[PDB]
Design a protein around this nucleic acid. Sequence first.
RNA 1: AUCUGUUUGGUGGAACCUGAUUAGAGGAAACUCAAAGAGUGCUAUGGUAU
Lengths: 49, 181, 94, 107, 99, 49, 111, 241, 173, 49, 50
Amino acid sequence: LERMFAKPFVGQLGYGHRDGVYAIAKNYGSLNKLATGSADGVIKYWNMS
Amino acid sequence: VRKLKHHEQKLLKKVDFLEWKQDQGHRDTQVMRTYHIQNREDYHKYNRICGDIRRLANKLSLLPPTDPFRRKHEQLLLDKLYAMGVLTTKSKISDLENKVTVSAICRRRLPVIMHRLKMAETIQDAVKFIEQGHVRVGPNLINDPAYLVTRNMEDYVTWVDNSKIKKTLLRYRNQIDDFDF
Amino acid sequence: AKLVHDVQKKQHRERSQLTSRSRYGFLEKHKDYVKRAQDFHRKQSTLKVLREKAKERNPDEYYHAMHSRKTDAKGLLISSRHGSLSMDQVKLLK
Amino acid sequence: DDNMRREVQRDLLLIKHRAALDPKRHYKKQRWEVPERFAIGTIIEDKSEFYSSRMNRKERKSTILETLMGDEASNKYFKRKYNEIQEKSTSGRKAHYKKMKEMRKKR
Amino acid sequence: GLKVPKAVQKELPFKSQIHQMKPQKKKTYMAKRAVVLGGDEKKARSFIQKVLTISKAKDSKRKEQKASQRKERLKKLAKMEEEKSQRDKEKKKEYFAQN
Amino acid sequence: HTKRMQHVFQVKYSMDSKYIISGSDDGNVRLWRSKAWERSNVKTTREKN
Amino acid sequence: GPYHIKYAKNGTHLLITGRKGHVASMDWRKGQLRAELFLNETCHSATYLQNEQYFAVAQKKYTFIYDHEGTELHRLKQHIEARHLDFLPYHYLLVTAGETGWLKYHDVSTG
Amino acid sequence: GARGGAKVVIEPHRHAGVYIARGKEDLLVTKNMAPGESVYGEKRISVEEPPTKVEYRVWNPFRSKLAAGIMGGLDELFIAPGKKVLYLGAASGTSVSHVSDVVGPEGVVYAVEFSHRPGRELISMAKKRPNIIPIIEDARHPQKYRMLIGMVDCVFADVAQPDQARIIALNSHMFLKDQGGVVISIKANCIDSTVDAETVFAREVQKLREERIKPLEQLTLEPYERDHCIVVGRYMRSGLK
Amino acid sequence: TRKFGLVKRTLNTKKDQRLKKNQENTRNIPQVSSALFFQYNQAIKPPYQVLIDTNFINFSIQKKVDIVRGMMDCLLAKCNPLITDCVMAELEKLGPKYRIALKLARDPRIKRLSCSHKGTYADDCLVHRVLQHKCYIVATNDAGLKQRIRKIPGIPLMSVGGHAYVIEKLPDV
Amino acid sequence: SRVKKRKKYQKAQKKLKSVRAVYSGGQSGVYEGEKTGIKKGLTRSVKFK
Amino acid sequence: DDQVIGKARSRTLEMRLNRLSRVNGHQDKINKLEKVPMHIRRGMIDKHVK
RNA sequence: AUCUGUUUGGUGGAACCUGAUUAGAGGAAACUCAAAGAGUGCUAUGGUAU
Ligand SMILES: [Zn+2]
């Protein structure tokens, strides 16, 4: 049963970055928040919920 | 058993309380229903005969094609079965393996032959008349509904002389002659 | 229509019965004859089938409907026009 | 009710075949088997529709068939059309056959 | 209509026995009893007969119309089917000319 | 893994320890279950046991 | 007669098999008859399968599996002249032995 | 056509709570909750049943867009007897009264309107129909009247605003049940007059999918209205896939 | 009293409900779009909305044709390219070899459409969208897809060939 | 040429009405019902797959 | 051909017939491996390769 | 009317052909006895048990 219920992927955050993601930081005080950055120079703040 | 949920079904794919492989698809029951056989072992006795015909047909096949023995025996086996009525045609030797079936032997049973001869409306109805002693083949009354009627004997199947059935036929056409009865 | 004049495709008017024979009726044309020939063959085809069915009839054929049904002294089937009244029924009707 | 009053029966039979009532209407194609639950009702106009969409009482009838035959244009139309169909259906039938055998007789 | 000879008619199987109905000559009691509503209802029994006669002929003519355009159309299509068939052969000769 | 994931450069946990956040160089930030067979709905006491 | 009797595992149902071929399945407390077969053969023993719904009967030469209402479901051709029948409930295995001296285990679930 | 004294045959429609009146012409009719009066002057059909005199109202497609939806043959309407319906953009009782008819005495209708001049008329019609809850408040702010609306089996929106996609979403999130119905009437001129009609309908459908509403069907309302389409969707909170 | 023709009761496969095979056992005609006058799509007007197929992006890189410029050159109108989630999924699924295609496909001018069907097969998704709404140009070079779009009436079909794009069923050109 | 294209177009308008419904100004006069009748069992509606 | 008897004659005929068929008959339909369950067939191949 | 004979409805269902089915097809009763399917109702409450 464990194998046929093993469905780890839940989804992806928005449309993602233009270029590869190289720096991810989690907010240690909030559960559903994340900060990411890409080689394009863009940094985003996500609402994981 | 209740309809199995999705997770139960995956863990119980092969469970089937009503159909097993050794049943061979319930070919037993199906042929019995169509021709209304009453003895549960009548199919398998017919099957064992059909197998033996098929075994000989193979052993003849493996013999070389031009062999006089092969041609002689195969022709004899075709004529014998055709005379019995099991085989409709004597042309092709492949019929011994393809068209030799239990249903072929069953169709020559007395209940079915009456139904084809229209002496009865249905096979079940025709079986009842045999058990009632209304049916004769030649001058001998027959109460066994498993009488296998050959092609030549199929001409002599008729109602009994004093049968109430025979009186209705003649009465319906206003041809009843009481001197005969 | 390619390389064909309109004059080529002119209706050819079709004649009539002579006056001397006018009593007998309409002069049949090929289309008229075809209707006759098909009609006769259609009937003859069915009539042939019925004769064959008579020849192959099994005298011993039994149907449970034979009790309700009745036949004529000529031998033809009798069928009720609509398909006896008890005295109590008649008294109410009267 | 199982009585199936003939006035009601003719009304529904006049709606299954409504395509032929009027030669200028030509409704859609549909079958309309008789439903097992239906009711007959009379329209009630608005008081503002007194001149436009109101029927006079003498014209009002309990049944549709009563109003339809009350008309004169439709009644005339059916007489013309029905007679024409009879000529089509009676052409070449037994009456015709006897005449052709009558001419062969000298008088 | 076809009239089967009585000799053939007499000896027919039970399944195929033609039902020929004899006319009634002695007046039945029910035939002498039933009441026929006259006057107003007569005008309302002819009319329904007149309506149903038009409706059948209208349908029987439009149905004949569909069969007329059915024949011309399929003749047109079989020509199109022929063109797509012969040209299909040509392509399979050009292709297998390579192979 | 996934055929659309190309070079994992960062991996992090949600602060509840139930999910995994992954960042590849393709430009997407994906969410994963820490335990594939577990589900996040509140379970009846009979389920839990 | 004579009659061979086998109760269900939970004791709710009773299966009696006459030697001349009278097989009856009933709920003996409430006096309810579930099925009654009059096989004109020599029955030797019968047993209940996983529950009262199915029971097996050792007839003259083959064992037959039947439904709650008495409808046949299978003819066990592989078991020949079984005289003793037993059911391992947890394993869903049917066991037979007879004059052939062959001990055959048959899985009811998979057949 | 359908004159005063003419008799008609009333039979049930495929949708529950809607009836067809046959004759020389066919009329879409709904049973009247408040017999003996007409709310916008429609024709009415009176039937004697054992005897009590039931009354029916004619439903005019050219006046109510939902009626045009029936005529064009919408496959699924979530408005049915014994169901709570939230009607946004209830200008007056022209169409709400007919929606109130279908749901029956058991069901209810929450009529939402903003402008006060029609509101006074909406209240007046509401008193005759007990199963109508009139809410004179802006539909852009569903929170203001959260006390007044419970769960609703379906949401019908005829609001003519460019930002209707937000109105439908916010009301659906608060009040619409899971697997519940959504019916929207879209007028392309109102949303974006610059671009053609089809793009607006295609654009509008996309917003619904973003808002977790699965569109089941779109129908255009011609010949009754030009530039209109009714989109029927199901509110699938769990997942639209 | 006894009945005649008694037969043993046995399982009837054809009629028994418990068996799986026996256990299992409003006409619709879609409206012809009001945007279509016979075969001419009257509703489509500039600027155009274009659906990009996965092959289209690759072949665009093959010929050095910019997506926005090639469209804006071909139709002489502003074109609003649209990439659905399926098309993006296929591009990601191709692998490291087609990374250039992915980076161009993410150009912010190229708008994104969400999708609500499980499969990633893009060909079916595009064909469904064009059927419902007659307001898209289909940009593809796949032979199979182009033939499907040709049967659907009033769907302009764009492809990349030679040195620049080509539009087939768009009268306004 | 002008006359022929005039008649070709007006003929085309007639055929368009048969293929699909067309807006024709809306209601004119009292609503007299649907002249050609209602079909209970037909949906002319386009379903998303 | 006249002397050969037994299985050899059955196998000989099948081999001859297949050879003539391969020229014109489509590869998928001319030759069809007999159906065997998954677990068995990998067993036969593994031993045969061994 | 020892007139005429088309149409509407009811009664009946030969031949050919087509489709489906087949231990022939049905019907009635119930506080009867079984084997299953769907929906609905019910604080349906130990996230670590006074
Ligand atoms: Zn998609």
